[PDB]
Design a protein around this ligand. Structure first.
Ligand SMILES: CCN(CC)CCS(=O)(=O)[C@@H]1CCN2C(=O)c3coc(n3)CC(=O)C[C@H](O)/C=C(C)/C=C/CNC(=O)/C=C/[C@@H](C)[C@@H](C(C)C)OC(=O)[C@@H]12
Ligand SMILES: [Mg+2]
Ligand SMILES: [Mg+2]
Ligand SMILES: [Mg+2]
Ligand SMILES: [Mg+2]
Ligand SMILES: [Mg+2]
Ligand SMILES: [Mg+2]
Ligand SMILES: [Mg+2]
Ligand SMILES: [Mg+2]
Ligand SMILES: [Mg+2]
Ligand SMILES: [Mg+2]
Ligand SMILES: [Mg+2]
Ligand SMILES: [Mg+2]
Ligand SMILES: [Mg+2]
Ligand SMILES: [Mg+2]
Ligand SMILES: [Mg+2]
Ligand SMILES: [Mg+2]
Ligand SMILES: [Mg+2]
Ligand SMILES: [Mg+2]
Ligand SMILES: [Mg+2]
Ligand SMILES: [Mg+2]
Ligand SMILES: [Mg+2]
Ligand SMILES: [Mg+2]
Ligand SMILES: [Zn+2]
Lengths: 7, 304, 219, 59, 115, 152, 108
RNA sequence: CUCGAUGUUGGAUCAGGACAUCCCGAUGGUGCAGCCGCUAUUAAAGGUUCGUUUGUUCAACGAUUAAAGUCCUACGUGAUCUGAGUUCAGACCGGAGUAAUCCAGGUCGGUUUCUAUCUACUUAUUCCUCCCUGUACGAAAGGACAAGAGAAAUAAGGCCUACUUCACAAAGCGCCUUCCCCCGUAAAUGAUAUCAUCUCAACUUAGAAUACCCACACCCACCCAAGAACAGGGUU
């Protein structure tokens, strides 16, 4: 859920 | 079990052994100083295309040198302590392009060696030596074993090549080894400052042999070519060589006439064998220079 | 007696034969060139044979900041401010293109190295070329001028206030604050001078050097 | 007398023996003429090494 | 030594040179394969919103041993083909500039002091 | 990488290492014997030799007094030093301390060594005594030695 | 990082049994003539060192209880004395300490 | 094929390769007098700048250079790095829509994990200065190419006597050394085809080696300019 992995 | 000599003898006997072996090896050197009284091999004059056996020396350090024009040249001092020949080989016996000789270097303890080489040095007549390096040579320059190689084997105005082992840095990084730019410091570089970064591509799926990456650097036989002689001093058996040379101080180095196309044919004015001080009508000076070197004790230069 | 700071070798290890050879060479040169005794903080005038100049000779007077190097490559630094601009030279005292040395004045400063004269006021290094030699008696002690020096504001190059330099000519009581000196004494490392394995005893080798100098001189 | 061997045609010029040392740029081809001049045995050696089967008994 | 983006002080007496301006002279190019600039090397210098060629008299790095070092850098203006702008330079300059007098004859002529 | 470095890294800094070996020397000077890890005593041996060399100067030398004050923390052993140990080695110039390797520590299995000022009071150590002159090889050696002496 | 295949017992066995991982058998032991126990060449006999240390520690206890507290280190040499011995003219001026035992075969 | 996860743009480091050559090399033609240029053949050994705003690749601009080449490598490379764009959760503006909310519209901000199990791997060029030379060439103007000498930059390999960062030593900003060519064409004689014709007719011409390493159970322990350990050198 945060761009990412896993921002 | 395996042991050493110092243990199975007494303190009153150790100095006896020391002085005895020192006297013995020094007497061997004094006996082999003069080869002409022995049986020398046939001597031949210089010819075009021929070669000369080099020698090996001991680096002391560096020094400055000034020319007549006042410009500077840094210079290494190479010393030759004993540097005796060890053996001779024939072209068809060694199966090589060219005949070969062997030259020894630094005299060391006869105790820290192997039985085979000890027997070899005994039957040869000389003490042991640190390094025994090989010199390619034509047959006309055949030199007998047990012959000392003095510093007069070379002269000023001469070009030369020198081989030796480099400084040992151990396992070093890709940067100091190969000279990569590295990665910046700030701007968010996370644990990547001196890394090599990429290694190869993605489709290649492997790393090419001969790729640059961290490893042991130094401690290898590297050679420098085209150096030049500025001064020879005979009583100390030291020679000057321009610029610099590989290796640490007090290292053994190999020296040979320069092989370059421009510096190959000049071998007529020089002794085709080594320099034999005995038997000559005259004895050379202590030191001798190139004509374009300001000699100490001479007046300061003054142009016009 | 007095020995030069370049006959003595460096702490590093090597064969004393190298030192002996370079020593006898520089002494064969000393037989010609006089190198009048001097120290740091002495004012020296030097004449050198330069290939390009009016008469191909170059004169230069300056205060000695330091004597560096060993052997034939030994040098001394000179400094002088002329026309409001500060020049410095590094002279090799065994080069043959130098014609002769002269000591206009012989002094010793509290600081063994005087590189802080860069940041010091120009008037301290302002020495005229036309000043004649201050004749000194042939056998007397060395005059030590116990003085202190004013300096440019803080924007320096070397950060002289630290204690590793162990220098005293500067006047930081005026040049900075009690707080800044207390902050600078942070780096105080007494174990440097209290340690006893790092220093280099010289008596042996300097005695040998005296011996060899006397021998080569009388020979 | 592997030195005194003869091909059929212009093989000395057209045929190429190629090998990669392993390093980048180490791909090198040599005509049979060059390969004969440098080693008169290698031609027949390679021919036999090819005719032979590819098992461990080949060596 | 002298390279890109170095505050230099013009030494000769020139209106363009010693005219006060809210930005100091700054070297933005050196006419060598590398970015460093040693004595006797042409460079390019920005003054008062324009740019002109110049020749650096002395740098504050230690070069050769007895070659002089200057506590501050120095440079003199010059036209494209060696016509100096300033009339004279009362400050000292290195003697190593008259080695190339074949090109800087007028720059050496307009000088007074030498070191 | 290091080439020619004579010192070795011991604690959490130069101050820390000189303090450590200072405590070692202060404990060694009074008992004139001490066991400790090999490297520490190895480097401290030179410190002790230099320390007694500067104690030879006597109690008058302000330099040596300040040095001993720094190096010794108990402040009761420097007079002992000047008045006992310098007179003890007034004749000798070197070989002030004997250093001998011993078995490892019990639990840590670290190599240890005992260091001891020569000419102590407490009992001696079981030093390694060289083989007797009466042995076969020593007797043959003495035989040809006396033979050479007779010849010359 | 993470493995991808369970390493086989035979390869693990080759790894952990190669001579590099094995222990060195050392031919560097001999008997001490005094005690009769075995010792490394360059190392001292542990038995002899232990007995010497015990004696040193007991005489240290004695000199400590004699001095009676810290900061009492004298500025003179000191000498031990065992039962059945008299101080010598040489060590009269030197401090003396008494001990309840007899002179062994090795200590002077 | 891969959605029980194949991690993007540009940039940094490292670069491997193709040649459809930007430079340097050798040739043919020219509407090539010469310096300048255009085109075509061969040549991939070597190299192919620094900055201003922009996330930028590109582009514009400034100064240069012999040159500032095109492309492939998972739009090479994020278990090596950055996250400035794009951009989840917040918010402002313009517009759409009643509203929720939306806009390849903008704008500020917004956590980039891994201890390596296996494969693989880990020691010579170029510019410039001088004679050629104001020469040939060229009405003049302009203006060389060859050969030679010198001084430099780059890349590689080494060194501490200067100097510097420094101090028993390590390093550069400092010092020393660096040697071979490349094939496309232009020429002789001469037959098929009796002249001629450079020859896929026989033939004649312009056409890599060298150097480096090299022996061996003394070897507990100690020292080392040798080294993570093992190893290597010394202990006279
Ligand atoms: C402008 C887009 N940006 C900023 C918003 C996103 C950067 S991105 O491209 O890496 C992101 C993840 C993969 N996406 C693809 O479009 C894509 C193309 O091919 C593939 N994916 C296949 C793979 O990449 C295989 C791999 O196994 C897939 C991974 C590791 C995906 C992990 C989960 N990521 C998401 O669910 C992302 C959802 C949003 C953010 C979308 C939209 C914004 C376009 O971004 C992507 O999926 C994006
Ligand atoms: Mg960096
Ligand atoms: Mg992080
Ligand atoms: Mg970091
Ligand atoms: Mg500075
Ligand atoms: Mg403007
Ligand atoms: Mg620790
Ligand atoms: Mg899966
Ligand atoms: Mg996965
Ligand atoms: Mg092509
Ligand atoms: Mg071309
Ligand atoms: Mg990609
Ligand atoms: Mg990309
Ligand atoms: Mg990857
Ligand atoms: Mg990326
Ligand atoms: Mg970002
Ligand atoms: Mg953004
Ligand atoms: Mg949009
Ligand atoms: Mg990461
Ligand atoms: Mg890793
Ligand atoms: Mg550099
Ligand atoms: Mg015909
Ligand atoms: Mg014809
Ligand atoms: Zn025992």
């Amino acid at each position: 859920x945060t761009x990412p992995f896993x921002x | 079990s395996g042991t050493w000599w110092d243990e199975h003898l007494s303190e009153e006997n150790v100095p006896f052994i020391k002085q005895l072996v020192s006297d013995e090896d020094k007497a061997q050197l004094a006996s082999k100083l003069c080869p002409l009284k022995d049986e020398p091999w046939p001597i031949h004059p210089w010819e075009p295309g021929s070669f000369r056996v080099g020698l090996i020396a001991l680096k002391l350090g560096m020094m400055p040198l000034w020319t007549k024009d006042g410009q500077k040249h840094v210079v290494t001092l190479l010393q030759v302590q004993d540097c005796h020949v060890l053996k001779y080989t024939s072209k068809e016996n060694c199966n090589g392009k060219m005949a070969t000789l062997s030259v020894g270097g630094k005299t060391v303890s006869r105790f820290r060696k192997a039985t085979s080489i000890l027997e070899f040095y005994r039957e040869l007549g000389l003490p042991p030596k640190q390094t025994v390096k090989i010199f390619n040579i034509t047959d006309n320059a055949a030199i007998k074993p047990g012959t000392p190689l003095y510093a007069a084997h070379f002269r000023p105005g001469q070009y030369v090549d020198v081989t030796a082992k480099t400084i040992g840095k151990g396992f070093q990084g890709v940067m100091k080894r190969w000279g990569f730019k590295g990665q910046p410091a700030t701007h968010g570089q996370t644990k990547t400052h001196r890394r090599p970064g990429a290694v190869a591509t993605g489709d290649i799926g492997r790393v090419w042999p001969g790729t640059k990456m961290p490893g042991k650097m130094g401690n290898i036989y590297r050679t420098e070519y085209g150096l030049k002689v500025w001064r020879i001093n005979t009583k100390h058996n030291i020679i000057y060589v321009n610029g610099s040379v590989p290796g640490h101080k007090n290292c053994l180095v190999k020296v040979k006439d320069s092989k370059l196309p421009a510096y190959k044919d000049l071998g007529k004015n020089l002794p085709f064998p080594t320099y034999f001080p005995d038997g000559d009508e005259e004895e050379l000076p202590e030191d001798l220079y190139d004509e374009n070197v300001c000699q100490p004790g001479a007046p300061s230069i003054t142009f016009a | 007696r007095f020995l030069s700071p370049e006959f003595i070798p460096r702490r590093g290890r090597t064969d004393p034969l190298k030192f002996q050879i370079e020593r006898k060479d520089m002494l064969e040169r000393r037989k010609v060139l006089h190198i009048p005794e001097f120290y740091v903080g002495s004012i020296l005038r030097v004449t050198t044979a330069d290939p390009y100049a009016s008469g191909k000779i170059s004169q230069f007077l300056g205060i000695c900041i330091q004597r560096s190097g060993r052997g034939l490559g030994a040098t001394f630094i000179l400094r002088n401010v002329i026309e409001g601009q500060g020049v410095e030279i590094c002279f090799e005292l065994y080069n043959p293109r130098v014609q002769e040395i002269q000591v206009v004045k012989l002094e010793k400063r509290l600081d063994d190295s005087l590189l802080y004269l860069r940041d010091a006021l120009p008037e301290y290094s302002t020495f005229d070329v036309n000043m004649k030699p201050v004749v000194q008696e042939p056998n007397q002690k060395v005059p030590v001028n116990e003085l202190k020096v004013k300096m440019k504001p803080k924007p320096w190059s070397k950060r002289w206030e630290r204690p590793n330099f162990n220098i005293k000519g500067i006047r930081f009581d005026l040049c900075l604050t009690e707080q800044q000196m207390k902050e600078a004494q942070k780096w105080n490392q007494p174990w440097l001078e209290f340690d006893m394995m790092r220093e280099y005893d010289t008596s042996k080798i300097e005695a040998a050097i005296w011996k060899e100098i006397e021998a080569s001189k009388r020979s | 007398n592997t030195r005194h061997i003869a091909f059929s045609g212009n093989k000395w010029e057209q045929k190429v023996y190629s090998s990669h040392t392993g390093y980048p740029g180490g791909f090198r081809q040599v005509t049979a003429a060059q390969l004969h001049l440098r080693d008169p045995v290698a031609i027949v050696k390679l021919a036999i090494y090819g005719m032979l089967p590819k098992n461990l008994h080949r060596r | 030594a002298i390279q890109k983006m170095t505050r230099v002080r013009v030494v000769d007496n020139s209106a363009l040179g010693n005219s006060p301006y809210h930005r100091a002279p700054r070297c933005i190019h050196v006419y060598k394969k590398n970015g460093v600039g040693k004595v006797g090397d042409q460079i390019l210098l920005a003054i008062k919103g324009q740019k002109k060629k110049a020749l650096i008299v002395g740098h504050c790095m230690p070069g050769p041993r007895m070659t002089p070092r200057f506590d501050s850098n120095n440079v003199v203006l010059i036209e494209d083909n060696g016509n100096p702008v300033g009339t004279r330079i009362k400050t000292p300059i290195p003697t190593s500039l008259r080695k190339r007098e074949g090109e800087y004859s007028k720059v050496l002529a307009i000088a007074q002091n030498f070191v | 990488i290091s080439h020619g470095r004579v010192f070795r890294r011991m604690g959490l800094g130069p101050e820390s290492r000189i303090h450590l070996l200072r405590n070692l020397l202060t404990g060694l000077v009074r008992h004139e014997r001490i066991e400790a890890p090999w490297a520490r005593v190895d480097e401290m041996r030179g410190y002790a030799e230099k320390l007694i060399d500067y104690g030879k100067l006597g109690d008058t030398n302000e330099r040596a007094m300040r040095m001993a004050d720094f190096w010794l923390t108990e402040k009761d052993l420097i007079p002992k030093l000047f008045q006992v140990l310098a007179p003890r080695y007034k004749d000798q110039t070197g070989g002030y301390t004997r250093m001998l390797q011993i078995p490892n520590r019990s639990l840590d299995r670290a190599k240890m060594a005992v260091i001891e000022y020569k000419g102590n009071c407490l009992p001696p150590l079981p030093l390694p005594r060289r083989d007797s002159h009466l042995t076969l090889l020593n007797q043959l050696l003495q035989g040809l030695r006396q033979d050479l002496r007779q010849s010359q | 990082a993470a493995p991808k295949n369970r390493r086989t017992i035979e390869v693990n066995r080759c790894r952990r049994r190669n001579p590099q991982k094995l222990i060195k058998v050392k031919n560097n032991i001999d008997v001490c003539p005094e005690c009769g126990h075995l010792k490394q060449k360059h190392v001292l006999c542990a038995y002899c060192y232990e007995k010497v240390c015990k004696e040193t520690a007991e005489i240290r206890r004695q000199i400590g209880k004699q001095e009676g507290g810290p900061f009492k280190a004298p500025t003179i040499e000191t000498v031990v004395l065992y039962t059945g011995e008299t101080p010598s003219e040489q060590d009269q001026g030197k401090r003396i300490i008494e001990r309840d035992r007899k002179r062994p075969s090795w200590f002077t």
